[PDB]
Design a protein around this ligand. Structure first.
Ligand SMILES: Cc1cccc(Cl)c1NC(=O)c1cnc(Nc2cccc(C(=O)N[C@H]3CC[C@](C)(O)CC3)c2)s1
Length: 285
């Protein structure tokens, strides 16, 4: 990891705030825009290990679809992690604020980028455990990059992760991870299928208002999320295969990247849409 001197870093605007630090947009020393995450004085040993451990993991990766680490401030206080700045923020909020503004080809290209990042992580023997649109960041080229790395800090810090009867984001998590804490790249594939559904719906909340227990019951009884509106048949087929109960039947990320790359390269393949089941009937004479 590159150790950066505090005098090179200018915090300009709070992007996010937590109990033990904040995330800032800033500039790094031509000066370059960066994101800056701080850890405030009084942090515990576990907080320090978790905080610097995220930078340690990120520093092991070099991929277009994985957030890039610029460096850390660890010699001075407060400590800081400095990354590239993703101008459009978190993917879930981004899509909700840009409803209907993109082509199907653009949406599928977002998914291919996410899948390539996840293929890299899985091959590097890194299991994400919290893959969801809220943990994807988007830059001004519309490139989607996987973020939120670490060990126990990932699910502990996510408000969507709730204590079950483990602390897990139920609607995004594979059955074996909910049931007996088996997190693997194949449970990340389940999550990727949910991310596919998030992207094609412009950020709808998975399973809408069903409670967590209701979601688990529905999944166990064989129900799956219905097709989004205006969704290519191939894309719905792919997300359905990500949601196979039997872990070993799910595609690997290599398969997902391959299929998405072929669909993008033959873009007419995306014009065949899966049927959408309406909830409203509008009848006019
Ligand atoms: C991923 C990562 C790990 C460790 C340390 C750092 Cl510094 C980072 N980097 C980042 O968090 C970020 C990189 N680029 C970012 N861009 C960005 C820009 C604008 C908004 C957001 C964003 O998610 N902001 C808010 C969106 C507003 C809300 C919902 O009130 C809270 C979260 C993120 S955040």
């Amino acid at each position: 990891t590159t150790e950066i001197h505090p005098s090179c870093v200018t915090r300009q605007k709070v992007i996010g705030a937590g109990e033990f630090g904040e995330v800032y947009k800033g500039m790094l020393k031509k000066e370059v825009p960066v994101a800056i995450k701080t850890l405030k004085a009084g942090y515990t040993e576990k907080q320090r290990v978790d905080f610097l451990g995220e930078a340690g993991i990120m520093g092991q990766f070099s991929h277009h679809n994985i957030i890039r680490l610029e460096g850390v401030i660890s010699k001075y206080k407060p400590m800081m992690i400095i990354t590239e700045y993703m101008e459009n923020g978190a993917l879930d909020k981004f899509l909700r604020e840009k409803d209907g503004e993109f082509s199907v080809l653009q949406l599928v290209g977002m998914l291919r980028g996410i899948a390539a990042g996840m293929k890299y992580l899985a091959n590097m023997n890194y299991v994400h455990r919290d893959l969801a649109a809220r943990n994807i960041l988007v830059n001004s080229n519309l490139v989607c990059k996987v973020s939120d790395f670490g060990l126990s800090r990932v699910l502990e810090d996510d408000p969507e992760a709730t204590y079950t009867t483990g602390k897990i984001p139920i609607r995004w998590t594979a059955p074996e991870a909910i049931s007996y804490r088996k997190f693997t790249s194949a449970s990340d594939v389940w999550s990727f299928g949910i991310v596919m559904w998030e992207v094609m719906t412009y950020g709808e909340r998975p399973y809408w208002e069903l409670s967590n227990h209701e979601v688990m019951k529905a999944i166990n009884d064989g129900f799956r999320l219905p097709t989004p509106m205006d969704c290519p048949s191939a894309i719905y087929q792919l997300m359905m295969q990500c949601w196979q109960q039997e872990r070993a039947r799910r595609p690997k990320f290599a398969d997902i990247v391959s299929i998405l790359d072929k669909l993008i390269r033959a873009p007419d393949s995306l014009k065949t849409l899966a049927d959408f089941d309406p909830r409203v009937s509008i009848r006019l004479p």
